[PDB]
Design a binder for this molecule. Structure first.
Ligand SMILES: Nc1ncnc2c1ncn2[C@@H]1O[C@H](COP(=O)(O)OP(=O)(O)O)[C@@H](O)[C@H]1O
Ligand SMILES: Nc1ncnc2c1ncn2[C@@H]1O[C@H](COP(=O)(O)OP(=O)(O)O)[C@@H](O)[C@H]1O
Ligand SMILES: [Mg+2]
Ligand SMILES: [Mg+2]
Lengths: 7, 372, 95, 372, 7
C-alpha cells in the first residue's frame, strides 16, 4: 500500500 | 456547599463537570486500553489497563474498546472503570458527597438505565442521582422552549421534538447512524486511494482525519463533478509516522453518508428526512414553531457546511409557506452537558433526584418511574 | 336561513344557527325570472348545508379543540407519578 | 362458460378466487419488492420487481413497498403489478373474459374507486366489474341480513351497522388504527427489551411474532400485575437466522392498543367505544338487534381473547337490559372474500355489473351511482 | 444490541 502496510 | 455532578456519559467520548458551570470540567474519550503484547521490563509502569487520555497516547501498544456501542453499554466491567476514572482521577471528588446526573439516549433497552442506577448506588454509594434524556438538555442549553433537537453524537443519532418544555415521546426518532459509522465508512473509502487502516489504534487516526478534513457538500453531484474536473480539493495530512497522505474527493463522500445511509448498506433514510418525518409526526398546531427552532447539536453535526445543506434539504421537503431555520450554536459540541447543568442547578429540580432511601423501597426499577 | 336542533338522550346537546344571504338578479319575463330566483336559492341552501357538514367534520380539531384538547401535546395520558416534571419548561421561561 | 372472479385486494394481503367456491384460490401478501443492491452474477435471471409471495420469500435483498396505505392506494403503478400477478400467476386466467367483483373500505375518496374502475376497464380489458363495500360482504358470509360488522383489516378498521342488507351510511365509523399500526407499536415496545427490528424486511419478522404470540387480555391491569409478579407469560420465538428471543409483558401490550389508542399516540376512541358509538348512532328500535348480532371479521380480530374482552367492554358500555353477543366466526380472515363468492353467485346480481359498453357511454363516474 | 446490530 502507500499508507499503512507496505504494498 | 455541595454541588451536583453532571456527567454526559455519551458514547465514544465522556464529559464531566460540576452543576452550575458554563463548560464541562473534563472531556476524555471513552476508550479502555489493554496491552496486547507482553512487557519485558517489569517494574517500569506495568498496569493491567489504561483509561482515558493515558489510553490515547499509549495506543501504539494497546487494544482500545468503547464501553458504549450505539448508545448501549456493552461491557459493564469497563463502564465501571470509566466511571471510576471520571470520579477519582479527572475530578478527584468522591461520589458519596454529590448527586450524579447520568444521561441516556432515547429508545435505549430497558436494562440500560436500570444497571446504570444499580451501579451508581451499589458501588459508588451516591446520595442522589438522575437519568435525563440526552436530547432534551440541548434545547434547554439552546435558550428556547419549543423546537426539535437533532442530536448526532458518536453512537446514536436522534431527533426529538419538544414543545413548551414537555417532550413528545410519540414523535421521537432514532437512527443508529452516528459519527463512528462515518469513521468506519472512511476506513473503507480510503482504500480506493491506496491507504489501509484496520487496527483499532489506527481507527483514532481515521477519526482525526475525519474531524479535520471532511466536510458536507451542498450539492453532492456538483462537488463530484468539481472533483472529477480539476484537482483543487485535495489536502495533505501527516500521520504520526510522517507519511503525507492526500485525500481529495474523499472529503465529502464520508459526511454524505449521513444523508444517504445506502452508502453504508443501511435501509433507513438520511438525517434530513428523519427530521422531516419526526416533525410531521408532531401536532399540526405546533409545527409552525417547530420549523423555526430546528437546532443541531452533538459532535457529528459540527461538519463544515452542514447548516446550509440541512436548511436546503428540509426546505425542499417542507412546504414553501413554512419558515425553515437551522439554528446551529457555535459550541454545540457540549450543548447536552450545558443543558444538563442548567437543569441540575434548578431548585425545582432539587426534588427530582431519585434518593437512596427511595431506591431501597422498590429496587432499581424505580428509575423507570421517576425519569421521563 | 335559520336552524335549530336538540338531542336529549341522557344529556342535552343543542344546535342553533342563523345565516344572512344577500345577492342581486337581472329581470326577464316573470317565468324565467323565477328560475333565476330558485337557482340562487338552490345554490345558497346547498352551500349553507355543505358548510355545516364540513364544519362538524372540522370542529373536533379546530373549534372544539380550542376550548379543550382531546389529548395532550404528548399524545399520551398524563403520568400522575411524574407531575413535577411538567413545570420545568416554564421554569426556563422565567430563568 | 365463465365464472366471476372475486378479488379482495385489501391492505396487507390480496385474496382472490373464483365465485362459487368456499375458499379463496390464492392468498398472497400484497407487496412489491425492489432489489436494494445491484446484481453481479448473470445468466440466472434478474427481475426489477418481485411481486406477491416471491417478494416475501426474498425479502432479505429487497425494499418492500405496500401499494395500499391505510386503505387508500398510494402507488397505482404497483397496484397494477399486484393485479397482473393475481390474474396471470395465481389465478392463471386472462381477465378479458371474466367479470370481477372488487371490494372497497367505506368512506374512501371517490377518486380511489374512480381510478380503480378505470384501470380495471382500460388496462385489463375485463368485460364488466362491480365494487362492493368490504364490510357489507362479511355480514353476508355469516348469513345475517342485519347486524353490526366490525372489520379490522391489516391497515384499516371500520364498523358498519347493516339492517336488512341496506347498510346505514350514517353510522359507518372509520378508524385508521389497525394491524400495521399494531406492528409498528410492537416494534417500538420490543425495543424496550433490546430487540431492534427496523428494516422493511424485519417488519415481517415482528409481524409474524405478533400474528403468533400476541393476545388480548380480559383485564389489562390484572394481567400487567401478573406479568410483573412472575414469569408465566414469557414466550420464546425463533427468528429466521436461529436467534431465540423472549417476550413477556409485550404479548398483550401490543394488541391492547386497539382498546386504548392513547398507547399508540392516537386521540381516537378504542374499538369497543367505536362499536358502541356505531350502535348508538342509529335508531333506538334497531340498537338491540345490532347488540345481539355483533359480527367480528378481518385478520386483526383473530387475536385469542378478543371476543370475551369485546363482550365485556360493550356490556359495560351498553345498558343492562340489552343482551350482548359477539359473533366471532372461526374463519374471520376470509369472511369478506367468502361473502363475495355468495353475492357474485346470486342469480339476481348478474343485472348489476357495470358493462364496458355502459362504461364508455357514461365514463368512469358511473361507478359513483351504480355501486352503493 | 442483542438482536439486530452489534451493541
Ligand atoms: N466537525 C465534526 N465533523 C465530524 N465529526 C465530528 C465533528 N465534531 C464532532 N464529531 C464527532 O461526533 C462525535 C462526538 O459527539 P458528542 O457530542 O461527543 O457525542 P458522544 O459523547 O456520544 O461522542 C464523535 O464521533 C466526533 O468524532
Ligand atoms: N391472531 C392474530 N394476531 C395478530 N395479527 C393478526 C392475527 N390474525 C391476523 N392478523 C393480521 O391480519 C392479517 C390478515 O388480515 P386479512 O383478513 O387478510 O385482511 P387484510 O387483507 O385487510 O389484511 C394477518 O396477515 C395479520 O397481519
Ligand atoms: Mg452525545
Ligand atoms: Mg379485509
Amino acid at each position: 500500500w502507500x499508507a499503512x502496510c507496505p504494498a | 456547599d455541595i454541588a451536583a455532578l453532571v456527567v454526559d456519559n455519551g458514547s465514544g467520548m465522556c464529559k464531566a463537570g460540576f452543576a452550575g458551570d458554563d463548560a464541562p470540567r473534563a472531556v476524555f474519550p471513552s476508550i479502555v486500553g489493554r496491552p496486547r503484547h507482553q512487557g519485558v521490563m517489569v517494574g517500569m509502569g506495568q498496569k493491567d489497563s489504561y483509561v482515558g487520555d493515558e489510553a490515547q497516547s499509549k495506543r501504539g501498544i494497546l487494544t482500545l474498546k468503547y464501553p458504549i456501542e450505539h448508545g448501549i453499554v456493552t461491557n459493564w466491567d469497563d463502564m465501571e472503570k470509566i466511571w471510576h476514572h471520571t470520579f477519582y482521577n479527572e475530578l478527584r471528588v468522591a461520589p458519596e458527597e454529590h448527586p450524579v446526573l447520568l444521561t441516556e439516549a432515547p429508545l435505549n433497552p430497558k436494562a440500560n438505565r436500570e444497571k446504570m442506577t444499580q451501579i451508581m448506588f451499589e458501588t459508588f454509594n451516591t446520595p442522589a442521582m438522575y437519568v435525563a434524556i440526552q436530547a432534551v438538555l440541548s434545547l434547554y442549553a439552546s435558550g428556547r422552549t419549543t423546537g426539535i433537537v437533532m442530536d448526532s453524537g458518536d453512537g446514536v443519532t436522534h431527533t426529538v421534538p419538544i414543545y413548551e418544555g414537555y417532550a413528545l415521546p410519540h414523535a421521537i426518532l432514532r437512527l443508529d447512524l452516528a459519527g463512528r459509522d462515518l469513521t468506519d465508512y472512511l476506513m473503507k473509502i480510503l482504500t480506493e486511494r491506496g491507504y489501509s487502516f484496520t487496527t483499532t489504534a489506527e481507527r483514532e487516526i481515521v477519526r482525526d482525519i475525519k474531524e479535520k478534513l471532511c466536510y458536507v457538500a451542498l450539492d453532492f453531484e456538483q462537488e463530484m463533478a468539481t472533483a472529477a474536473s480539476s484537482s483543487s480539493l485535495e489536502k495533505s495530512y501527516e500521520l504520526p509516522d510522517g507519511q503525507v497522505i492526500t485525500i481529495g474527493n474523499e472529503r465529502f463522500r464520508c459526511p454524505e453518508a449521513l444523508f444517504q445511509p445506502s452508502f453504508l448498506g443501511m435501509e433507513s433514510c438520511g438525517i434530513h428526512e428523519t427530521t422531516f418525518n419526526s416533525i410531521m409526526k408532531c401536532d399540526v398546531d405546533i409545527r409552525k414553531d417547530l420549523y423555526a427552532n430546528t437546532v443541531l447539536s452533538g459532535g457529528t453535526t459540527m461538519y463544515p457546511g452542514i447548516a446550509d445543506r440541512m436548511q436546503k434539504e428540509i426546505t425542499a421537503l417542507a412546504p414553501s409557506t413554512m419558515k425553515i431555520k437551522i439554528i446551529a450554536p457555535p459550541e454545540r459540541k457540549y450543548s447536552v452537558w450545558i443543558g444538563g447543568s442548567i437543569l441540575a442547578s434548578l431548585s425545582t429540580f432539587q426534588q427530582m433526584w431519585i434518593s437512596k432511601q427511595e431506591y431501597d423501597e422498590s429496587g432499581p426499577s424505580i428509575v423507570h418511574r421517576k425519569c421521563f | 336561513l335559520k336552524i335549530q336542533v336538540h338531542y336529549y338522550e341522557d344529556g342535552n346537546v343543542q344546535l342553533v344557527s342563523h345565516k344572512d344571504v344577500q345577492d342581486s338578479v337581472t329581470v326577464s319575463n316573470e317565468v324565467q325570472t323565477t328560475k333565476e330566483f330558485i337557482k340562487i336559492i338552490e345554490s345558497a341552501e346547498n352551500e349553507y348545508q355543505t358548510a355545516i357538514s364540513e364544519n362538524y367534520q372540522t370542529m373536533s380539531d379546530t373549534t372544539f379543540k380550542a376550548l379543550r384538547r382531546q389529548l395532550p401535546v404528548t399524545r399520551t395520558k398524563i403520568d400522575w407519578n411524574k407531575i413535577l416534571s411538567y413545570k420545568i419548561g416554564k421554569e426556563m421561561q422565567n430563568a
